[PDB]
Design a protein around this nucleic acid. Sequence first.
DNA 1: TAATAGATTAGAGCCGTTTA
Lengths: 294, 131, 110, 56
Amino acid sequence: AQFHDQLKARLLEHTIPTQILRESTLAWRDFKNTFGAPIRDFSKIEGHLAWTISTAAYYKAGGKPWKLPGVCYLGLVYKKIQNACCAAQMFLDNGDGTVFKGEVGPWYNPEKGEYHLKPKEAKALLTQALESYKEQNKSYPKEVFIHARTRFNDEEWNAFNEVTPKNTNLVGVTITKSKPLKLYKTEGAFPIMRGNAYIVDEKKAFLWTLGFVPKLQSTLSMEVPNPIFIEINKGEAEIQQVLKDILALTKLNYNACIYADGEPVTLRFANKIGEILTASTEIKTPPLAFKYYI
Amino acid sequence: MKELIYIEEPSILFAHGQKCTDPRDGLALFGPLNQIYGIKSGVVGTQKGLQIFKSYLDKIQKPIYNHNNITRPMFPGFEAVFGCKWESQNIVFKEITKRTYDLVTLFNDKIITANKNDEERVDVWFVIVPE
Amino acid sequence: CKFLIVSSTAGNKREGVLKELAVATKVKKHLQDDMFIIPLAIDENLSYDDINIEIVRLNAIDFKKSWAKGLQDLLDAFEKQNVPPPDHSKSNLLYQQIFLHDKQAIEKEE
Amino acid sequence: RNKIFISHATPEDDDFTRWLSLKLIGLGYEVWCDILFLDKGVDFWSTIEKEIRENT
DNA sequence: TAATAGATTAGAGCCGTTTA
Ligand SMILES: [Mg+2]
């Protein structure tokens, strides 16, 4: 179970991009179920398959396939080991480049199930993101966007707003999946098109990051879509702009060449880097770039 | 009865300043932003895995068609999309011949031997795991 | 100026493409320019034999391997043959006019 | 008549012929190579003959 | 310490490739 993550973690100290491909993946005709079709039937997706691998390769070889100001998107995720908080970051350069580095150096919360970040660790994480923004864009961010698969406590939020500098607004968002609102469509046989959202409240809403797409004339998700519940529990912001930002974050999946993923890419990337990091022993100042984990 | 608003889909940029919503079509039409000259691929695995990777990398140059070309766009071919060479005959191959720990360690130490000791440069190592 | 004919196993013997090709041959004789019809061989199964009678005479472009190499062959031939400021924004605004017209988020209430 | 012609096997023997051709143009001599100068979308054999017996 | 709930949350696996 733990080959891939441990291998990447043991490769981290010497920064070398690596892509792991299964032998049953590249030549999937050979490996049959011994009674019929191959174990991995990829005929309908082969070309798209040849897309993603290629894109992944082109990402790990130092290429930027596609890009997306003054806003730092800092999506953090907790990992159960003691707990480890690890984040993924993105900004926008002065030269219109979209820096999509990570936020690594996981912060250890000793409580077994408290998916909350300790005050000192929260200060360290937020100030690390701030210094990354300063060294990247030569000035402090106008806005930092923190979002996670969890709600946020109070005392930690005091730590965030006390470590942050002036002229810096922080908004905390929680994205949760499989919230039981499986909205269908009355007229047709095809589900609600992706891009539609139900505003439950001024701070909470539902978003359909996945579903029917006009351009593809098909659904990103089979059966019925599972909308993501987006709750602005802490911080101040308007629901439309945050919803736009979440839909934009659902575009930067460099791990695959797919139209869009059902969850924001920032959380998924932070989660993957966290899985790789906690797979093996502790390493100081890890690479922090996703070509080494993803 | 509650309204369902629509958020305009964000445009992911591509080469020549042109924007599109689907990454596949945007890549196959305009291409990626920065041009690497080529991918010096590295491979770690058995000889049969090398044959599989080489055949697949040869197929990548050709175009592969999805069964539903209008739902998921097809692959033009690697050089067609990215404009960088990833041929299969210029690969740096390293043959191999608690169980998770030593299974990882084989690839770890072979890859470290190749990156450190060997002269040939590798942009990214394609570990072709067995099955 | 030029007449590129795709040389797949289906696009080399169909009635319509043959009609366009024959008119291309006659207009080629009209301008007496030998660099008019260019076959683009894109079919792996279709060999350089079994190809059409009019187009077997002509120097094809190898698209069968590495479609980008064939495309580069196309540009270098076009520059060599003096075929007449590139702006990809034209194709950017043209791609969704024709290819994405039944496929868009139109304004309708559901 | 002022040209130099190089005939060769087309699939296998390309590297030497291309190298020799490019060296020859570098020296100033005119060359006609079927993998360098034979233009796409022409009658390849007809142009080969015309070059053999017109400018060679 | 055990239990009964809701609310969050996290991990793992598993099949299909998105109706033309
Ligand atoms: Mg991947």
